Amino acid sequence: PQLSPEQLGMIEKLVAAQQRVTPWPPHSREARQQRFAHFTELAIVSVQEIVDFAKQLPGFLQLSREDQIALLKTSAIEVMLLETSRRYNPGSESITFLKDFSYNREDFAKAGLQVEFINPIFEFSRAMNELQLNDAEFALLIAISIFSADRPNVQDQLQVERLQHTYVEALHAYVSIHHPHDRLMFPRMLMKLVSLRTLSSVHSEQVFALRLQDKKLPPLLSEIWDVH
């Protein structure tokens, strides 16, 4: 599968598109609220970066604004988890957000998350780290996740699917250059998108658990994740 000049220029555009928060601090009321506030504002920053990345993707703004919202509502968490697994450090078992501070499993627990979400985030991040994806493989997989035709309330399913397949073909042609003696490396990346839906559903159980303990989400995260 030969990489075309049209695919080459598209891939490099996606790499180039990827190029103040409340600070993390005894255990008190103020301590657990600020850690929850730091973690959720890192998510707010991420959504804004996801939207801005999606605008740069060929075919996205030509879709209806409704379909743009529909794709970004359900894929936001999946892009966030992919970007989490990119920043995973295998030696310390921790993830570096915002280029300075690293966060382990107990740091995720201190930020308000339950353990049945945390251990699936970290197992996935360890499994993604074994595959050793670069910037171009990550940007393509983010784009395949955004352009999923089977998301709720998507009108033009045929165009979203046709768009998806062009990034899929670009991924096949890229990985043939990157791993030319391993043909399994292209479908191993696609098999991680299977794992990403289970984690998105495990995240739905986390959001539902936050209503039961009354820890309310900020406005932008509440409109994308809470059931109204």
């Binding site: 959504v47 939207v51 919202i69 509502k73 309330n153 994308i224 109204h228």
Partner: peptide, 15 residues
Amino acid sequence: SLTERHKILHRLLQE
């Protein structure tokens, strides 16, 4: 619609 329920997300896509 979804657009009426996602006012902040719509405004990020508009800007």
